[PDB]
Structures are given as C-alpha cells and as structure tokens.
Amino acid sequence: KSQIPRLSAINDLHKIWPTVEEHGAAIIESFLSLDIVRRLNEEVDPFVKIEPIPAAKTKDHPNHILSTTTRLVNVLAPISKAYREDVLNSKVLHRICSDAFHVYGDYWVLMGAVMELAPSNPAQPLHRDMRFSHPIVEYLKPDAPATSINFLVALSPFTAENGATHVILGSHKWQNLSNVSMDATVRALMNPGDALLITDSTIHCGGAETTGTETRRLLTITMGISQLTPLESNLAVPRPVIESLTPLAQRLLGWASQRSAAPRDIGLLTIRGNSIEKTMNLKAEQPL
Amino acid sequence: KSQIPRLSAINDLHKIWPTVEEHGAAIIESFLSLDIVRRLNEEVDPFVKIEPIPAAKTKDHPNHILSTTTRLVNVLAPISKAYREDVLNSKVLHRICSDAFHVYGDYWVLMGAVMELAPSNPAQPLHRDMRFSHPIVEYLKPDAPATSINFLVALSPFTAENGATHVILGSHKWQNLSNVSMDATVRALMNPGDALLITDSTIHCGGAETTGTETRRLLTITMGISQLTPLESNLAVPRPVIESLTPLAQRLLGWASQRSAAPRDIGLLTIRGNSIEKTMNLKAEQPL
C-alpha cells in the first residue's frame, strides 16, 4: 500500500491542495521553520503543564472524547507571539486554504490547539473530525467540497513507536465505512515543523505511544469556511493583542466581518451594511 | 389551490413546527402582541428613516439584492428594548426553534432585521433565503432538516394590494425548480403581530406594492443552528446592554458558548473547556 505523499512547502506549493483533494492527506515538509517551532513550544509550555484533564469537573464544556493522558490548549493568540504572528500569517497555509475554500468564500480558524500526549497514550479510534461539534457536516452531499481541513503540525518527532498519526488514503471519498480498519492505514512519520494535512472526511487517528518514555506534541489548526462556527472563541482576547495583529489574522480569529463566494455576497457578521472593523474602528499592526 | 395554514400562538403551539415541516409555511396569528408591535415600531422608527439605500457607496458590505425602495435595519438589540427583552425571550419562538433544530443542537439569531418597503416597491424575484451568505446550504442533502427558519412578522398590515409575501406551499421539498412561477403562489395576508414562518428551502418573495400610498414594514427573524455563522454581529453592542439580557438572549446574540446535539458534544465558541460566559464573568439581567 502506498505512503502519504510528501511535498515541499517551498517548491511544491501549488501541488499541495490538489494532492489532498486526490488522496485525502499530504505531508508538508518544513511547514513551520525550526525557529517558529522552538518559540511556539517555549510560549505554550507552561499552559500545557497547568491544563487539567479534558473532562475535568471544573469545566462547563468538558471534552469526554480525548484520553486522560491528553492535554489540549486552545485560544493560542493571547499565549503565543509565534502563533499569532508567524502561524496566522503563513503564506503556505493561506495559499492552501484559498485553494481549498474558494468555492465557499472566506475561511477562518475553527480551532488552533496544542495537543500533548503523555507517555503510553493509547491510539484514538479511527474517526472523521467535526462530528462532536458540527452535526451539520454529516448532512452534506458526498461530492460537496471539504468545508474544513486540519493541519496537524509536529512540534516534536512523530515516529511509529511514539504514536505518529494514522490515515487511510482515499477515505475522504468513502461513503460505505465497512472496510474501516487499522489494516488500511499508513503513518505520518514527521520531523518537528512538518505538517500532516487532512480534510474533515479523511479517516484517521492518533497512534499508540508504545515506548513509555516519549511525550509527543502537535499544533492542530482546523481551518474552515467562515460560514461554520468556530469550536473556540477569541471574544475574551484583550483588544491590545487583537490590535497588534494583521487584518488577515484579525479575520481568522473572528474580529472582522466575513464574505461568501456568492456573486452578490451580502456578508457574514456585518453591522447594518458595514464591517466589524469599520464600526469598532479596529486598529491593526499596533505593537504591544 | 390551498391557502397557508393559520395557527394560534396561544392554543396550537405544538402544531406550528409540524405544519411548517409538512407545508413549508404557516401563519402564526398574534405571534407578537399589539403592545410589543407598538413599542418595537416606536423604537426602530428613527433608525429606519436614517438608513441609506441597501447598496450605498458608504458601505463596505453593500446589499446589491434588495431594491432601492427597501430599507433594512439589523443589529436591533441596542436599538429596541422590546426586541431584546420580549422578542428574544418569546416562549412561542423558542418552542418552535427547539422543535425545528433539536437534531442539530443549539440555535441562535442569524439576523433580526426590520425591513420597510416604500410605496410602489416592486415584487422580489421568487427565491430561497441564505444563498447570498451561506453557499454551504446548497450542498446539504435534500432530506437534511432545515438549518434555518425565518419569522416574517408583520409590523403593519400585509394585504394583496400592498405587497403581502408570496409563498409556494410544498416548495421546501422541491429539487427540480422548473415549475417555479407566481402562478403557483399563495399570499400571507396578515394583521400587525402575525408572523409568516418559512424554512430556508421555502420558495417565496415579497409582493408588489400597487397602491402607491402604503408603506409596509416587517420584522424578519432568521433563526438558525449555532453551527452556522450569523449574517450580523453583536460584537459592538455595549456590555451594559448585553448584561441587561437574559442568559438565553445572550446566547442568541453570540455572547455565550453553544452546544451541538452530539451525545458527547465538545461545544462551539469555548475557551479551553470553559464557556464565554464563565471566562468573561458575564452578568445577566442587570437593569440599565
């Protein structure tokens, strides 16, 4: 069985989305530079350590899906300068997203999260994303273009023994799910900064951590059309932080109005025919 | 040809959604009381008068669909006490919406707008709503439950001669649109406070104003699943106004996290497993 296609972020940029469209998955080598990975890790480190279990009793929106050996930290903009500046303005991410979502219109971040898997974390069951937040997605026609995609960025090494992600190639086009098995999977072996890109229909899972010593970390960036509601809110992010961002980054975090691809688009999150950014007089690129 | 079913808001409450489900439209008699209509009208009056044309050059999100003899005013919460208190907490609206959207989960306001049609306003072309903002909706399977519904509330009399809404009964189930004609329509004749309820698949249009003297006004409330992005933003609504609302009204305006109907729902607009309202310490029902 054939492996996940590997593509250069520098050279093969126009080939990335067509590849995912065909196979359901692609590995983007050096999606983030090692410098960006280093700064991202440093900035999120303490927030990963203080994060409780996903289904902690203190939470009013507990995650009952993820294992107790998973830690997930979202709403990264206020935590990480590298995220809000480098990741949110990634030329590669934006080319892929505009290739992917042009049929629908504008796109934004549905969730940007760091996930850290403790030693001996078991494999996740094979799944498609979005089913515990957006039931609407299951009612889309089979040939509907993907309404969200997920960049699974390695922040530490992904190996077969430490739980590298499994994917079933071609499974984004499957309607009958009788042949879903771990026998049908291939692995996303990745160095830090490489990204596995999948769609919301790609059948995949986190792998089993089998060493008992290694901690695997990733940055998962679910990008989706602006017509779908994000899993996370940036409503509580301080205005100085928001005003430090580019207009594009502001749009990605829901601090701007949005547009569909309809020829006479009437817009999303508008205020009596005017945008959020015009109405609130929202500055951009103001240093902290 | 049969007329639009007419139902009591007081007596026939459980019958309303089943009726719309079957026929694509229903008239809810006295959906709003005359007192609520009176206060709503008084409060929005000046904002309708100052509103420019829908496609005004001053706007960065112009509406190129609506006629120059239409005035549309949305983001009503800061304008109208009657809207934000009485309309947003309507027992009838909430029963219908929970009946309609239980398969998907939470719902909210996609747009609440007052529309005023000037004398001699021409008929709109026959259409389905949501096509100039949510291209995603066209990619839903034919049997997918409606993801949004529209309450067209009469704020002045709707008559045949002054442009009462046209609907094609049963058209919410149509896939082939070859028989779409004004010959297939019936009218929503309504007194102020009556509401025409349709789905996002019901083929309908505003009627022709033929008197040359009468100004027709309506309150259009598009309610939709919380998984779809609103056409309008309440991000710029002052915090004192938001904190005056009920928790339910806050949720409807995007000032709360949201839930899907998935058995192990992980939530929408959450902040590291906690809700917007918990994180921002958002008060509710604090008088101005």
Ligand SMILES: O=C1N[C@@H](Cc2ccccc2)C(=O)Nc2ccccc21
């Ligand atoms: O919690 C998340 N569940 C997944 C689904 C899933 C996870 C584990 C096992 C089975 C299913 C999801 O739908 N979305 C995301 C996306 C980014 C990070 C976490 C999740």
Ligand SMILES: O=C1N[C@@H](Cc2ccccc2)C(=O)Nc2ccccc21
């Ligand atoms: O501008 C709006 N266009 C309509 C569609 C339409 C209107 C006129 C003529 C043809 C199509 C819509 O999709 N949504 C709404 C909903 C509430 C108020 C206005 C509109």
Ligand SMILES: O=C(O)CCC(=O)C(=O)O
């Ligand atoms: O652990 C991984 O590599 C995959 C994680 C994943 O698919 C998820 O949490 O949704």
Ligand SMILES: O=C(O)CCC(=O)C(=O)O
């Ligand atoms: O004018 C009416 O009664 C219908 C208005 C309408 O359908 C719309 O503007 O979307």
Ligand code: NI
């Ligand atoms: Ni997943």
Ligand code: NI
């Ligand atoms: Ni309409």
